[PDB]
Amino acid sequence: RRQHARASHLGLARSNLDEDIIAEENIVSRSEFPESWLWNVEDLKEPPK
Amino acid sequence: NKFVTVQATFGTQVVEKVVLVSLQSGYLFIQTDKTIYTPGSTVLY
Numbered sequence: 870r871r872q873h874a875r876a877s878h879l880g881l882a883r884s885n886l887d888e889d890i891i892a893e894e895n896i897v898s899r900s901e902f903p904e905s906w907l908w909n910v911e912d913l914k915e916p917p918k
Numbered sequence: 919n920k921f922v923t924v925q926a927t928f929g930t931q932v933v934e935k936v937v938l939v940s941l942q943s944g945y946l947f948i949q950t951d952k953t954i955y956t957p958g959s960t961v962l963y
Contacts, residue, residue: 900954900956901956902952902954904959904960905951905952905962908962
């Protein structure tokens with residue numbers, strides 16, 4: 870990396886330094902979802918049709 | 919394996935057959951709202 874920064878980096882270039890996508894591994898899936906609600910029970914008692 | 923003999927009297931005639939016996943209890947079904955939680959959340963089942 871010292872060689873890379875000595876060769877391809879210029880202080881007067883006026884051109885932005887190249888950026889490389891990380892393209893990493895070990896990607897972790899989502900694990901945070903909104904909490905559940907409506908935790909109640911009811912009994913149907915109306916006259917059936 | 920507990921057995922019982924079943925004997926039927928058909929008028930004068932008789933037919934006998936030994937049949938196996940066993941008992942079943944039932945079933946349990948467990949329902950969870952989510953399969954992936956986080957430390958701090960509540961598990962409802």
